[PDB]
Chains A and B, each alone.
Chain A
Amino acid sequence: IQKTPQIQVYSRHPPENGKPNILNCYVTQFHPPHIEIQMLKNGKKIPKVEMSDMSFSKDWSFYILAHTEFTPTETDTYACRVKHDSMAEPKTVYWDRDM
């Protein structure tokens, strides 16, 4: 049986134009374990992405942290396309510097 994923997009360091940073995509609460994660910018796939664990927690639900180096800007859109079996269609959360 299947649990639906809770996605969060954010930055390691409080964004700042021109300053180096790393984009986080924290997926949570899912089941089964197979999941697919895509980092995107301007609708195109960020090429090098680095995934964490395949760990879980006390309620037995899995979690995963994906990340990529990125230089924040006012000119582009950054997103995280998740794809678990618990959803007919992929989900895509958008990076929003305010939260």
Chain B
Amino acid sequence: GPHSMRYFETAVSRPGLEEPRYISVGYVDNKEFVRFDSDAENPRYEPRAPWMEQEGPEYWERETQKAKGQEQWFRVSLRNLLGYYNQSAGGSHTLQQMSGCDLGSDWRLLRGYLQFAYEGRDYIALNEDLKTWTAADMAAQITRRKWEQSGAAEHYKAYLEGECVEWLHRYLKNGNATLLRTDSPKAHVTHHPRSKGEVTLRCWALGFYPADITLTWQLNGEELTQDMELVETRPAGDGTFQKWASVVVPLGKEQNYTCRVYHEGLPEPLTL
């Protein structure tokens, strides 16, 4: 099974406090596993999985050592960006970064990521090649020239090709405590009518993992895409996801109306 590891960073300024809010948040495959928040009483990285509780102190502070560094880096960078855009001091800013890696079925790397986004918009980001950057807007070029100079990308690449991989592998190997499991969909149709011509059919799907699912209504085999109420794949609060899809129907036709269901963790598409 393919895997990923993600760090979701976010600094945030609001006025009247010269000291922003920093928050890192880790994720293995689609599941959180660590977390830091500068605005805590004791700002320290924490386990968020059960399998993570299995680390012991040197790890727990090798990371909090880093978080305090990045905290300083974000404070600094947020101010720099202020200048590149001519924003005066006085409002709410946001800087986010996302970094991680991906590995195929065969445990090997497939892709690295390192990308930033200022104010919600892409700012600068690292290429599939790990050697060169893509700057999004003019101001983003300052940083680019600046960073080509200081060889910042090698470091990144190193973290991505090495310490990311080597470390994920071991997350995987303590990881079965949820990671390598595939919770299959649990699908059934609702109803709820009234009105002539109305019946409103509802194909649900529940308890699956990962969130990738495609429910499809069909008349014989021609995909009933018309007024298909599709809901956004939502989380259950447990490690699984939900979803449904409605289609409107002339009451009493329900026979040859049929939503198929699709998922990695299934034997074959669930016809309903």
Q: Do chains A and B touch in the complex (CB under 8 A)?
A: yes
Interface residue ranges, A against B (CB under 8 Å): 1, 3, 6, 8, 10, 12, 14, 22, 24, 26, 28, 31-34, 53-56, 60-61, 65, 67, 98-99
Q: 1/0 per residue B229-241: CB within 8 Å of A?
A: 0011011111000
CB distance from B160 to the nearest CB of A (A): 18
Given contacts A54-B37, A99-B244, list 12 more A-B pairs with CB under 8 A: A8-B231, A8-B232, A8-B234, A10-B242, A12-B236, A12-B237, A24-B234, A24-B236, A32-B12, A33-B94, A34-B92, A99-B231
Q: Is A10 a contact of B25 with CB atoms below 8 Å?
A: no
Q: 1/0 per residue B216-234: CB within 8 Å of A?
A: 0000000000000001101
Q: Is A28 a contact of B232 with CB atoms below 8 Å?
A: yes
Interface residue ranges, B against A (CB under 8 Å): 8, 10, 12, 14, 23, 25, 32, 37, 92, 94, 96, 98, 117, 119-122, 190, 192, 202, 206, 231-232, 234-238, 242, 244, 246
Contacts of B23 on A, CB cut-off 8 Å? 54
CB distance from B36 to the nearest CB of A (A): 11
Q: Is B117 a contact of A60 with CB atoms below 8 Å?
A: yes
Which among B10, B121, B122, B238 has the greatest number of chain A C-beta atoms within 10 A?
A: B10
| Residue of B whose beta carbon sits closest to that of A3 | B120
Q: Taking A22-B237, A32-B94, A33-B94 as contacts, is the C-beta distance between A98 and B8 under 8 angstroms?
A: no
Q: Kindly state the separation between the CA atoms of A10 and B10 in the bound complex, as whole angstroms.
A: 28
Q: Is B120 a contact of A60 with CB atoms below 8 Å?
A: yes
Contacts of B235 on A, CB cut-off 8 Å? 24, 26, 65
Partner of B192, one of A12, A34, A98: A98
